[PDB]
A paper describes a structure:
Spike was then mixed with an excess of CR3022 Fab and incubated at room temperature, with aliquots being taken at 50 min and 3 h. For the 50 min incubation, collection of a substantial amount of data allowed unbiased particle picking and 2D classification that revealed two major structural classes with a similar number in each: (1) the prefusion conformation and (2) a radically different structure (STAR Methods). Analysis of the other major particle class revealed strong preferential orientation of the particles on the grid. Despite this, a reconstruction with a nominal resolution of 3.9 Å within the plane of the grid, and perhaps 7 Å resolution in the perpendicular direction, could be produced, which allowed the unambiguous fitting of the CR3022-RBD complex. Note that in addition there is less well-defined density attached to the RBD in a suitable position to correspond to the spike N-terminal domain (Wrapp et al., 2020). These structures are no longer trimeric; rather, two complexes associate to form an approximately symmetric dimer (however, application of C2 symmetry in the reconstruction process did not noticeably improve the resolution). The interactions responsible for dimerization involve the ACE2 binding site on the RBD and the elbow of the Fab; however, the interaction does not occur in our low-resolution crystal form and is therefore probably extremely weak and not biologically significant. Because conversion to the post-fusion conformation leads to dissociation of S1 (which includes the N-terminal domain and RBD), these results confirm that CR3022 destabilizes the prefusion spike conformation. Cryogenic electron microscopy (cryo-EM) analysis confirms that incubation of spike with CR3022 Fab leads to destruction of the prefusion trimer.
Numbering used by the authors:
A (entry chain H): 0 to 132, 137 to 219
B (entry chain E): 334 to 528
C (entry chain L): 1 to 219
């Protein structure tokens, strides 16, 4: 490979705090590379923020990000930086750094992105979606009122992946996320097999195992 | 038949920016990896072209422009710049395709009594067109009265010398600059990469 | 300042057929020195950084199949995926790198065009545990269907509900190319105990008649 861009880890910050994420180029010929920053909000397209030439720190910004962020660089360690002074909730996105030898050249190398989260937390309430009473019956778990994304849901401690649909979360009008994860199973299993959904929510340190069974 | 980038980059004597020197690169294989794998360059800004991606590319001709300026003025060797060097000495077009390579040459182009062989143009009645070279030494008429090739009141000699002393701070010490430009016409290509 | 507009926003093409995406620039991107247009094409998939497919309007980047090809000049450019394959389903952006600021297109979603499939419909009453907290969530599931379009109408004692439900659709399944949908009716514990029949009426292309699933509160 000619160049590889490693990026700093995932950031969970509070509104108002400052933040500085890095992007280190690993490879020879870095003297010729220009590093840009691309923001991708959750579920949205790609926004080019700016670009910097580390050799002399020439910096160009997009008009949508001029004065909102500061793109610096440390040419002694082949590292480019992107920093905020006061984080807003509207800064929650994934930030890719992209490089390319030269300016007005294609960005042909990308890092795997740095996901930034500017948010308060709340653990989810887990409620059972019990099956109703030949063929196959469906059941699930309702994961409601949590912030922020994501929550990870698995069944039987990960021993039931076949036929599972964990729906993408939607933002309720209360500002909290709601989500449902359902699984279809043979109808004769409801009398024997135990069905447990495991809901993990890292930001709130909550782990819930919920027993699902038909309502007698 | 490797391209003679050595006799351009390691030329014992460079040239003043007002009389910048151009080397025509033709009928040779150019291994640009020697350029960007070198650890002895301060600036390597390429525009509209990727130096790591053209060792499998061909061009009709490649031009190597070399001169000497000071550190404050290296940023002026770029498209869309203004100043003494960009307007009166060496201008790049807005759609410039090539690289601007520069490195500090204080160990070479400085003398204890001050190096005064490198000159730059201070005045001119109009800005330079891209890749234009003016070497005239006509007296610049700055006022209403016309000079008859005589230097005097509102009548300036157009060339001033750099004061390259080894004790100058960074930005006033000399930098040697090489500008590689690439053209591609509807004509045979003679400068290709080793691939 | 150059602005890019892609078209179409969404594109469904059958396996092995030709997909074409158009990109319009508000300004030329032609360098005169080297007769090349400074337009690039990127592909992005979930959880992955963008992948460069084509640069200089019509030059293929390494690691790109031969079936990707670009064309165009001036202000109209085209990305062409001939013989569309399974792993070609992604979002495609056109980027200009003529001058800063770099700008992207809005994005073009490319999906494979399957046969219609009716959804299996289920309905779930709210749990007794949630009712102690004062809220009631009624979930209606539409499992494994195509196409995505499907009207879901909540009915509470035969009264059409509006402005109190949210829908969510899964990603297209890799094996059978089907979606799944969950509609969630939310109302207070008081309002939930005022009525008896909670119904979910699903209208879909694969159903010759609207399928309704319902339950009576506490039975």
């Amino acid at each position: 490979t000619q160049m590889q861009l490693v990026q700093s880890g995932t950031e969970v910050k509070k509104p108002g705090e400052s933040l500085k994420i890095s992007c280190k180029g690993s490879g020879y010929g870095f003297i010729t590379y220009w590093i840009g920053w691309v923001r991708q909000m959750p579920g949205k397209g790609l926004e080019w923020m700016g670009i910097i030439y580390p050799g002399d720190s020439e910096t160009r910004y997009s008009p949508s990000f001029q004065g909102q962020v500061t793109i610096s660089a440390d040419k002694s360690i082949n590292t480019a930086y992107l920093q905020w002074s006061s984080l807003k909730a509207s800064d929650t996105a994934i930030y890719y750094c992209a490089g390319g030898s030269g300016i007005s050249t294609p960005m042909d190398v990308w890092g795997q992105g740095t996901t930034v989260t500017v948010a308060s937390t709340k653990g989810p309430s887990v409620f059972p979606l019990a099956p109703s009473s030949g063929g196959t019956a469906a059941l699930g778990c309702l994961v409601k009122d949590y912030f922020p994304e994501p929550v990870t849901v698995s069944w039987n401690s990960g021993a039931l992946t076949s036929g599972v649909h964990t729906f993408p979360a939607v933002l309720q009008s209360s500002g909290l996320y709601s989500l449902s994860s359902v699984v279809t199973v043979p109808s004769s299993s409801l009398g024997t097999q135990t069905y447990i959904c495991n809901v993990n929510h890292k930001p709130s340190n909550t782990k819930v195992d919920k027993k699902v069974e038909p309502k007698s | 038949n490797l391209c003679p980038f050595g006799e351009v980059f390691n030329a014992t004597r460079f040239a003043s920016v007002y009389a910048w020197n151009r080397k025509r690169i033709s009928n040779c294989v150019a291994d640009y990896s020697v350029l960007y794998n070198s650890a002895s360059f301060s600036t390597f800004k390429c525009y509209g072209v990727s130096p790591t991606k053209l060792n499998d590319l061909c061009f009709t001709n490649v031009y190597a422009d070399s001169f000497v300026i000071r550190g404050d003025e290296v940023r002026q060797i770029a498209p869309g710049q203004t100043g003494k060097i960009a307007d009166y000495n060496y201008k790049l077009p807005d759609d410039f395709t090539g690289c601007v390579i520069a490195w500090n040459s204080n160990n070479l182009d400085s003398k204890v009594g001050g190096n005064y062989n490198y000159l730059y143009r201070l005045f001119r009645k109009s800005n330079l067109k891209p890749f234009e070279r003016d070497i005239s030494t006509e007296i610049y008429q700055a006022g209403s009265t016309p000079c008859n090739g005589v230097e005097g009141f509102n009548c300036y000699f157009p060339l001033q010398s750099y004061g390259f002393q080894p004790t100058n701070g960074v930005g006033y010490q000399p930098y040697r600059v090489v500008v590689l430009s690439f053209e591609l016409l509807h004509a045979p290509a003679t400068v290709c990469g080793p691939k | 300042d150059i602005q890019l507009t892609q078209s179409p926003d969404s594109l469904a093409v059958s396996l092995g057929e030709r997909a074409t995406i158009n990109c319009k620039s508000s300004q030329s991107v032609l360098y005169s020195s080297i007769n090349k247009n400074y337009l690039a094409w990127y592909q992005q998939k979930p959880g992955q950084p963008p992948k460069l497919l084509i640069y200089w309007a019509s030059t293929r980047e390494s690691g790109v199949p031969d079936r990707f090809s670009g064309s165009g000049s001036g202000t109209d450019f085209t990305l062409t995926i001939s013989s569309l394959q399974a792993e070609d389903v992604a979002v495609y952006y056109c980027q200009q790198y003529y001058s800063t600021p770099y700008t992207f297109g809005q994005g073009t979603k490319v999906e494979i065009k399957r046969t219609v499939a009716a959804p299996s419909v289920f309905i779930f009453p709210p749990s007794d545990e949630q009712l102690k907290s004062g809220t009631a969530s009624v979930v209606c599931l539409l499992n494994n269907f195509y196409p995505r379009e499907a009207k879901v109408q909540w009915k509470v004692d035969n009264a059409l509900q509006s402005g109190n439900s949210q829908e969510s659709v899964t990603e297209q399944d890799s094996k059978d190319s089907t979606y799944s949908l969950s509609s969630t009716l939310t109302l207070s514990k008081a309002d939930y105990e005022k009525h008896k029949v909670y119904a979910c009426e699903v209208t879909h292309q694969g159903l010759s008649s609207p399928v309704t699933k319902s339950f009576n509160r506490g039975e």
